[PDB]
Symmetry: C5
Subunit: 376 residues, 5 copies
């Protein structure tokens, strides 16, 4: 993930132009190889035309170039690119929104599962670890970076996400499917056992715990669904062929012809086709947006930091359920204990951000005395 | 379903160009016959024009071709196709999202329904089987593959999805409607009976079970609604007529005219309309996307794997509710039992994915000593 | 509602072409009268120009055609139609999604409301009938077909949806508003009475029932809102004028002038404007899609089957709450009682749909021995 | 709000054409003044050009007209208008969807708040009046019509929405913010008091009441947010500048030049620029749609009927919570008491709407005996 | 945040025209510097071409001028700008919708947390302060104005949002991540303590409180996600490159060539490219919309008022949980105590807004005696 929120916080002079001096996750980094290939082919064709071709062959090549330049518009690359990229971006944000965060579940577990002793600590840690194990299983099934980190269940055991007993259990229940769903059944059964054993005081608390776990399960199922059901290959091929055919046509239709013939478009000859290169950047970068966002769990610069998410979730959930359980800061009267209208101060750099309350768009409407009189 | 997520994980050089080589569920497989027909018609017209027509006929044909060429417009067809395809793709993804997964309900059943004895086993299995039976009924109503697998309720009984007693009850209840709703009423009544018999210990747990079952029922109802209420036939015919009128006009407007006549745009006389064929590929593939995705439960290569979904749901739900009930791995302290900040290790292949935590976009904002001072 | 899902299940050769031979709910059926009027006007203008203009007249009619045919492009017909029809289709699907289905509420009632005696039967039937009565009241307020079926509350009483006592109570409560909301208050009060009388065993069950009933009420309110708040009249008029002015201009801009004049494009008199007719079909059908879907509760072929929905809902809900209450099939061990991995059989027609489970896109990633080794 | 649903129920001949004869909430009513100003400017410029200008001044004006006519483009304005109007319409429908309806809360209050005596009547009426008071406060904050009806809290007291005691309490609680949130705190505290006093029999019922009240609070907050956070003024100015620059250019670029000059675009002047006026109609009406819908709580014809909504909500909620409390129609067996399959009759006007049930798209598939046999 | 809802309440004459006289948050304020730079470059190029080039160089520049003009298109730029700006606007509205408001939680806390003594006051205030502290932590993480107001946790303690004990606890819990999640765990633990101590009378009320707190936590997590996962830098660079390349080509393509050369479209030599400047305004403002809305928490005119939101939330929540707890206005019969149909009066200004109730679109349908007769 490449973040430039701090850079684009305000709409300053050349705000988006300053972002053109970036390399990581940039259009240059994404399409420099394709641009080099296109440049090589373009200049190879140019040299072939100027040198190898005879006079009649050159005349035929010039007619071909004029014809290709005239027929290029008949490729609606922009229409298809816009629609396809919109679809890809929507799927990308949905896939992010389906990333499971254990914060709500961990707060519920810390609040509800009682016991400051070893048994209570173990129960809370086991529940949060089941949640994290399910999340990590789905993530390693759907993300190449997570898979490289944990290429096997033995790797998961060594990393601490799974105990040897849990690994042995997963083996006994093994079925010819992805077993990311097992930790949720484990969580349900362990929560029921805790409620029956008095560690969870009420069925409403148990139900809340299971509701949070089920929300996480739905998120993981959505991640699996996005991984499995790819965007239609036919649609992807349609967009790809459009872009590639456009630029393959440009390779012959944007060659500078010998000025001796003085064709309307080719009176002046400069070696570099600057506007063809600009079109290449525009269209191929538009395509690269989809090429990078189609699988947001790869190893691209703008792909999600799944490994960091996993590490942070483990740390935060374990800390919340173990060290933060029934461990609260001292409860004392606050700064505004007897202040009817608290007014937190402003710093010098923030004093200009003090605004009056907005009371509604009708607040400033002016009416006469007779206008406001109720009628019988 | 055709999956290429592995292939498109990273935005490598020519990633979509590599996908262009796939055959299954591809644009070539979808439109080769239509392309053959279009090519045959185009070249029949060409041969007629250049072999049979007299001089006057040829002059009239050239005038008509020049007249036709101006009519062809890309904007209207592009708009109609883009909107129709966007609607079709949105409906296709919604239809997938309405596929019922019994994971949440099965975890709830495994947790809440008590009893390791034969009666408890039977109760849990019957509940999960009612859920799966409703799912399979709707799926065989809406999916041709599932229907071919289970062409009759007797086939459902033979496959083990429905018992002879359940089949008899369904026949007794038969109404002139799709009876896919009966298993949900059965599930509600059986859950109420289990709660009254002490197998379910709390009405809160009963309510959670019924909420999950009702979510499944709503998903099945959405599947039925998508199967029943097709996209407006008028809209489908409008898009089809747009595409066919465009290409029928092309069949003449794109004919190469005798270059001797020195017509404005017909200098070069190639035998193949390369750009017209590229337009055919793009637009007919865009239409084929909607043709394939309009009914995602058919037998297309890109259609859903309803049979696999049914089998996996049955196996997973039965295992969870029967073998996984109150069967948990030993609860023991984990690797980070007394590690305040656990740090799971990284492998050699994943060490490059270790990232520092993102602490916010305002983190790096610099302020002076005076700027950070509160004012009264 | 015209269903062609079975026909468009697979993307076959001419899949959408075969849909052009349909009559009910078709473009021809929708716009044949408009096309006939346009054709009559066009051929009246042709005859007027060819046999009523002296010559200077003919010369000015030519000049008017060579002007209308050129400024015709000024109309943003495609943009307007696309953007308006997208909104119309979205509203149409939302209106369908707000159709109340009593399946969840009826399962909840059948389960929760206890008593196999006459009083229990009456209570369950009365609750489900209140739900159905509210649904039918809103449907007859918003749908012309349902109103024609039940043009009065006396008709509702004669049809069995409302009791004479309920009709008298409605007349007693009558306010100068649509009284479709009364059955929901009746349902809430009857459920409270049933809980107080011991027929409902728990406030949690009562809350679940009221949640389902309130979801139904929200759906009915959304139906009322869609009926009341029509799409902006200015927005509809803009698109209507855009289409009508375009096709009124075409009447004089797409005429075949005298070939003697040798006007460019006007040299050949084909009599029949094939492309003008194709454009008429395309655009007027794009507009007819919105015309038909703007009120999905009218009497068009593609409008919702509100009467069938009412009948099916009544029958299904009554059966579920009366005949199916505490009436379950015998609970016996299933076919896979002791089968760890059940595998339902495949028929000959479906054997090709047996697929290997998808284990994730990272499943086939290959790594070296050192790549998978954890580092310190 | 202008309603034409009954008029557009069926897609009849000229269904949308018949709507061009309406005045209220019409494009004519919205843009007639702008059209008159534009016409005056156009015919001032035309008369200056053919009268005041000298012989070479006319040539310069013709050159300017051609130069301007070249730069009049449809796609940029069309695209910006489409996107902006789509956003405006989405916000308009969301703002309607956030209008609070007290129906669910009133049904819950009537059911749960027990007691047919004076204390119970007062409690139920006070709760429903708190809900209505919050709704009215937000409505008078966000709607000009509601503000004009109730320009002060004293007006609210006189109208009966607030008691003098509630007005005094609001004055005591006065903060420098909009105080529409106070009635929700009042409702929560009164509900807790009622539960503690035995009037509400269960904390589950209390929770349901508070959930409905909080849903209403969220709707009111969304209304406040839409009132406060307007669409970006930059975006509005961009769209306005696009439209106005277009039609300011059209003032000179669409003048009828001298036909004798034989200019390509001007061989026949019609005095009245019919197509220019049609473009003005289309684009200015498209912009006026957004102008009217940007604030749907104004006083336009198509703006929401907030005053009627307030009146109806008050009347319906008070009736439901006071007169309909534990007042049910006599519970008696219905018409289909012992009818296994009820079939309500059809009138002569609706007999054609009787339909056979839809059993699924796979119902009609035909399979051979060998094809339907399960394989080992 | 710039509000003009009161200005655009009604669609009046020049409604959006009067919005062009605004400076704050205006297109002029956003793009004046860029327009100045573009103008300076354009006139530098013009002066060079007109006073420094020789005859042959001027001829070459003239040819390059038409070459550049031929290499300019509007369709792709409009398409990409429209889709990118739509995405940015959707994200902007989502980011606003994820701003946490403590209204529902504060009402629940005031209702449920019992006790008018100091312990109860302290408990309620501490819970509401935990919610506000979490909100403020996320806000200072994601918003530059809030960060400048509270550049440190010491600043938060000095402003009263955090106590010294809470600050010490946060330091003790410090992890290498954003610690904005700690207050939710604190809230859950304090709520559990309050329920166990009898301050919360029921686990149902506890569950409601925790559900509201978890909704706030989800909103804060969405704010963090929007701050962290920026829109793809490739997409941003693509849009920026499109716009900037378009105008870079325009710099030379829109130069006014020497009129003496009588080029196709350069007869006039207006010194100011009025239409090029209008296009600059249009497109650069369309881009500046996205530039301003990409980070809605900066310090732009149209950016959210996070500081005011924080202050208002603190004041309102503290008042609601402390002073408004069990402090209700006297419950007395209302104005319509025994009026079956209350009719609040209308003022002279709003008398015209009194409307008859909408009874549905089928209300005015007319039927015959035979038509409305039920059939056998
Ligand atoms: Ca990727
Ligand atoms: Ca299909
Ligand atoms: Ca209709
Ligand atoms: Ca308005
Ligand atoms: Ca900003």
């Amino acid at each position: 993930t490449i973040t430039y929120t701090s850079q684009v916080a305000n709409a300053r002079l050349g705000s988006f132009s300053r972002l053109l001096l970036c390399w990581r996750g940039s259009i240059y980094k994404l399409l420099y190889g394709e641009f080099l290939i296109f440049l090589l082919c373009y200049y190879i064709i140019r040299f072939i035309y100027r040198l190898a071709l005879t006079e009649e062959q050159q005349l035929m090549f010039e007619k071909l170039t004029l014809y290709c330049d005239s027929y290029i518009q008949l490729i609606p690359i922009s229409f298809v690119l816009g629609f396809y990229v919109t679809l890809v971006v929507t799927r990308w944000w949905n896939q992010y929104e389906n990333l499971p965060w254990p914060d709500r579940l961990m707060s519920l577990v810390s609040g509800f599962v009682e016991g400051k002793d070893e048994q209570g600590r173990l129960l809370r840690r086991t529940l949060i670890r089941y949640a994290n194990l399910g999340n990590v299983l789905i993530l390693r099934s759907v993300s190449t970076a997570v898979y490289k980190r944990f290429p096997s269940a033995q790797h998961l055991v060594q990393a601490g996400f799974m105990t040897p007993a849990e690994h042995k259990q997963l083996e006994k229940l093994s079925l010819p499917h992805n077993m990311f769903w097992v930790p949720w059944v484990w969580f349900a059964n362990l929560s029921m056992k805790a409620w029956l054993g008095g560690r969870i005081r009420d069925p409403i608390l148990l139900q809340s715990l299971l509701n949070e776990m089920n929300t996480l399960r739905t998120q993981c199922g959505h991640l699996y669904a996005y991984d499995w059901i790819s965007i239609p290959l036919v649609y992807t091929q349609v967009v790809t062929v459009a872009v590639y055919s456009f630029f393959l046509t440009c390779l012959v239709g944007r060659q500078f012809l010998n000025p001796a013939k003085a064709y309307p478009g080719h009176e002046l000859d400069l070696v570099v086709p600057v506007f063809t290169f600009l079109q290449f950047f525009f269209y191929v970068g538009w395509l690269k947006v989809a090429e990078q966002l189609i699988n947001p769990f790869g190893e691209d610069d703008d792909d999600f930091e799944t490994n960091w998410i996993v590490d942070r979730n483990l740390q935060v959930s374990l800390l919340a359920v173990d060290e933060m359980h029934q461990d609260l800061p001292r409860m004392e009267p606050d700064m505004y204990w007897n202040k009817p209208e608290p007014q937190p101060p402003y710093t010098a750099a923030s004093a200009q951000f003090r605004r009056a309350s907005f009371m509604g768009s009708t607040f400033n409407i002016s009416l006469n005395k007779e206008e406001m009189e109720f009628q019988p």
